[PDB]
Symmetry: C5
Subunit: 348 residues, 5 copies
């Protein structure tokens, strides 16, 4: 007659099989399932999610008579009776664990029990515009159903612990329905571009601008070839660091990688042209690559020195003319390309 | 009749259900719960904590008669009877582990048993003033309670193994109460700024000072543009290192990131101005960007050389005047900005 | 008479041994096995795979009479009866995991049950042409069979969730057969060379081309020896980065490592000869390594100055001639070597 | 009458409670416990240890009669009887694991069984003098004891597998007793200073010596400010590397961090002074920061050039003298500081 | 009479104790044990191994009568009877895993069953000659044996899956015997020096050669001190990277560390002497460290300029002589040291 006695008798019943008597169709209600994001990986595009759900089903064999047992509820260990397992079929490595060791059972057979599902979903995201990206990820929630025996799952509400999970920010988690009456959660993922814009795009933009203005350095004065090779080996490091953390899979791959490649090529070409111009200024032609008498001798020497200085000036001015032409052309194309690349990366 | 026989009888009773006889309300006492911090993550803002608690509850069915059994205590395996599970509902990934395989039971039904809860809590900390930051983190301690059946938790004292856990230092762990009679522990986390200030803030401040002094280098003499390009590509590396370990989530994001961005922009602007001044000094105008007779001829040559030297001096002096004006302007704005930025980062 | 009663009776049968009555030969059918790649490691050449299979076998003892029990199916817990374990013998660390806690059993003894095998396979791949590489990996699927008792496994179809797993791309998963009637899955792995070509090959090619054009810098003008030492010390970093992520095992090791080594050696040789040429130009020979009168005196001084300048010019032109000869030789040899190495790395 | 029959009957007795008949006091003997260190973490100051112990206790219920059963020993599974669990109360994450599945039981009740305890101990070591450091770490060995029931643990001998565990070297492991009759193991940890010395201290000392010598570089000749900026940025990198792997907790924090900070400050000050001196030499004053006639005119020009050359020589010599005075003072201070810091780091 | 009925009766026998009837001495035969290496760590010198063994023992109680049961073999679950646990006593963290959930038992009591042992062995390797190193590692295979009860292990053959495991290459795995009749496996580990020689030794060799040839750069011309300081801060990075992956334990520590230290010291000394020679050339003495009239005056100025240029030439030649003497010393000493160190690192 004790409530503990009722619990013990229910344990001794050993009902470790599901209530499949009614045509092997068990309606399982899961109201108020709470979703949370634990991490997001950008290189692998994999989402770690935690879903705390409240399963509520019916077990007719676990229903006593109220007259003999004057109680309305009883708490039993989870492993001493049957309990459904909830799966994330869409993702890999799904694991369901029990929040508590005890579950409540009412006098009419209703069973309430809270569970936690940790899942890893191979999310597909349109990462073409890094970092200005964001997309919707489906997460399937399913319970076992094979052939004739099918246990429908009825879901009511979803609550999301929305908040940044690192670089990525989870915006919403809504409940939608699939084609074959499959319930799933649509999770909206977005990228906070405040970090990538400052750490990646801004330094490269300033570096390209510095290269554009680097043509002010005179060829003869020096401090120009080293200045540009420093930029080149810095942009190579940038390319390596960018490649270390973005997926170069296939169609709609991130376009920042191609932009870095093109900027590196442009910088290398500019440095090459600068070095060739330096040689032209120094030598005067690009042939390196291709295979009272005492009072008179003094004015002869003086005019010889003057003529030498004049030739030095002329050969230092011709290369300056060529450098000016190339600088105008290069700066125009570089600015137009940078504007086009930004317009593509933000609105395409 | 032996104590081992009594223990075996209690094992054979198989009371694996909760002592829910008295209206399904079991008061669980947890006096002297010890808290310790294992790690703190600054980027993800996640706290790993270990709580060693001493649960002490009542099991009426596990109470023998003292006259037949002349003993006052008996130790039984934890898995052979019922035991409550303690949870950290506020945080993710909570696991409760049995410290020992045995528990003590008195003759009046009281059961003493110690447990260890390892939990990971998504801590919310105001990280605006990195590294001068510190805040209070709630850690909930809860046990299962559903519907009619509730088992209240009564907590008495908290002891903290206070000590640095890396960059972060745990200051205190007090016991407070929530709204709906929920017991929780408030943990005070603080940042030891001795490490971040030396490794991060001091080198950047000294580099900025070196940039402010860098204008002393003569434009014609060289060694100025490469000197600043080294600083710029070092500050880019500093920005990357800062972005690697700080959360750029949203409002009240760390201000050191914006400070590094602004310092980098100022350095790049100083470089551009210096390079333009170098071109102006070399060429004389910013048009590169914009599209007895023997005894007399020697005097002509000498005065021509003297005039050329005078022109060289004048073009090297005009750029010096412009550089001085820009240096005064830039140094005043830089000092005022650095003072304002430190004032913001310290007391805002 | 209840279906739950039938399930309980089958549970109480306790049939935890395999149906080996028929000559200890159990045919196990596994139709529609789905293969997916989780990760591929290039340095260790290890493949992580997940195989979701649908096992379907026969258990004669688990077959009831339809007249007494008017049902066609029943779902029982997986651990209450015997279930085969599927292994990946070819690879290491194979683990079979239960998809659900229930399995369906028909009235004639047929049992349907889904399993998930996670395996890690030591894959052998011809990585000579990094990154233009691709190969077929065998994955064995087997069940326990010792001596007289054998359980043949009959497979029907394989479905692959083809898609990039990082750097590597899985193309197909077909079903083939081994010699001794062993069923296995051939998985086609390919490398997306878009990432390695941009991050590794292109910067090195551009750096090498820059080294070839660096000979334009005059010996006296400076900015040349440092320009080359930066390239050499950057190529050392490239060699380290390349070594950090590629298996240098033995025969048919990646040839990009040898190519990087040879390019570094060539750059070092070019720098050495350039520095020797600089010394020759400065000193005039490679011996450092080897152990009216007033109106006339001015003419003498002017002639001495002119002769000194003439000697400087001649000693600066001889080294220019030597540098031109070496530049022609070096450029021709380096271009032919680069073309040959690319031809080897692409189509050999 | 079979030994296997005796083992089966002992198993069937189901003695899963501890031998608490004798006043609930069980003397547990653990002779010849072997200690080994698996790893030491310098940043977190956490010790990973493995202890292979040989527990030997008494179980009166597991004692048969020799006349009926003519045997002296029997081996039983560990899980079929009671076995004590050994804990490391001082440290976190203590786990006890059975070395074998079987244990030996004698005819008089004595039970021999070997166990392995893996523990993580939060070690407190005086790391002020990195790397010349070393200290004694206590490791508690304890078994469950609550209230009236206590089971004392009697230890005899400790043997340690001495050998370097990375940077740290374990020297000894002795057995001592605490205040409240608690047995513990004192482990002597020491740092092999050869690796940290050669990788951190010697390069920094050599860099500081190079900085002290760098004053020989002439102000006008160039190649000086780039040298010092390379030194300073390399020292900042060293500061970052040092901060990445040393605990900056509080009092008696490693003093190498302060030494690196002070040396960096000194280098920056030397750079600033050198740049200001260079400007003074170039300009002549620190005001940039503060807001027959033909035969005669040639003599005028020549004396003007001579005067200008003399002024250039004087303004170079004044800066040379100032640089000499600063060099003397700076080198004296630097040598005295380096010697004092070495003395503090080695013998304080 | 059914084979399944025979298996069920064997399961119901519940023989979970070792077959210890015959003097508690059980001969366990393990023929054809296969060894494989999973990973080798160079810094910690720890070997990860997988051993797939085929245990074959005798269980007299698990033997039926052939006349009543006309069968020769039967398959039983591994957990329903006794099974030995194979251990790796020499190494840490040994785990034995069941290859299958079933085992075969013959009519005469013989039991065949394969197991998998994963072990981690603290290997002792003579790493003095890195990378030209290689040594033999013992791996113990043992079963539980305490006091009177001893289970001998009889091993027949070992087959090894030879193949590179990263940097390390496993050559052989033979079976030997210890002193006290203990069976163990000797595994031959060797280092593929193709990777370390290319990534570590060769770049340092060319860097050293570049330092030796760097003396060609003239003192006055510049581009020398920066060239050497770049090499010095590159060699410091090499020292750090080498220290990151090699064990500096004690006697017979790798000599490449000492070699890198000595090369760095030599480079620093060469840089220091070059920087001193620069000042000697510029100033003329090492005292910085130590505390018709018109037609005639023009001749006076001209001869003064000539004398000044003559003094410049003489002071630029004396330092050249000193530099030549030092270079003749230094190149010979360094070449002899490099040859001696290579001879030591190869054949000592
Ligand atoms: C069982 O009783 C509970 C308690 O009110 C109620 O919520 C539930 O709907 C009932 N279920 C059925 C099938 O009557
Ligand atoms: C049971 O006895 C213990 C031992 O003194 C005591 O601490 C506890 O308060 C008692 N509980 C009750 C309900 O009497
Ligand atoms: C058992 O019945 C199922 C259901 O139709 C069928 O698919 C299967 O082939 C049958 N097996 C045998 C052996 O009759
Ligand atoms: C039991 O016998 C063993 C075997 O000699 C002995 O070592 C041990 O001391 C004995 N213990 C007692 C309590 O007699
Ligand atoms: C048992 O029979 C098997 C099968 O031939 C044989 O290999 C084994 O040696 C036999 N063992 C004994 C003890 O007879």
């Amino acid at each position: 007659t004790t409530r503990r006695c009722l619990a013990q008798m229910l344990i001794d019943m050993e009902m470790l099989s599901m209530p499949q008597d009614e045509n092997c169709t068990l309606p399982i209600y899961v109201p108020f399932i709470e979703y949370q994001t634990l991490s997001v990986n950008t290189k692998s595009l994999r989402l770690n999610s935690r879903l705390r759900a409240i399963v509520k089903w019916t077990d007719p064999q676990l229903a006593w008579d109220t007259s003999v047992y004057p109680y309305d509820a009883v708490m039993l260990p989870v492993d001493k009776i049957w309990t459904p397992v909830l799966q994330v079929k869409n993702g890999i490595s799904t694991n369901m664990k029990h929040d508590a060791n005890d579950l409540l059972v009412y006098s009419n057979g209703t069973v309430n029990h809270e569970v936690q599902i940790n899942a890893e979903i191979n999310c597909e995201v349109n990462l073409f515009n890094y970092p200005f990206a964001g997309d919707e990820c489906p997460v399937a929630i399913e319970t076992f159903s094979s052939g004739e025996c099918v246990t429908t799952l009825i879901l009511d509400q979803v609550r999301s612990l929305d908040g940044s999970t690192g670089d990525w920010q989870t915006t919403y988690a809504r409940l939608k329905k699939q084609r074959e009456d499959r319930n799933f959660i649509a999770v909206g993922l977005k990228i906070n571009y405040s970090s990538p814009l400052m750490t990646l795009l801004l330094p490269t933009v300033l570096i390209v601008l510095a290269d554009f203005v680097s043509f002010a350095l005179p060829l003869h004065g020096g401090g120009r070839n080293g200045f540009k090779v420093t930029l080149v080996l810095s942009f190579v490091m940038f390319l390596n660091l960018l490649n270390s953390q973005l997926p170069g899979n296939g169609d709609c791959s991130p376009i920042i990688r191609i932009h870095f490649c093109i900027c590196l090529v442009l910088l290398v070409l500019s440095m090459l042209v600068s070095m060739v111009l330096t040689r032209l200024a120094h030598d005067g032609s690009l042939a390196f690559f291709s295979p009272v008498q005492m009072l008179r001798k003094v004015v002869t020497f003086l005019q010889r020195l003057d003529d030498q200085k004049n030739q030095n000036e002329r050969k230092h001015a011709f290369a300056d003319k060529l450098d000016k032409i190339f600088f105008l052309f290069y700066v125009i194309l570089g600015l137009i390309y940078m504007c086009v690349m930004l317009g593509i990366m933000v609105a395409y």
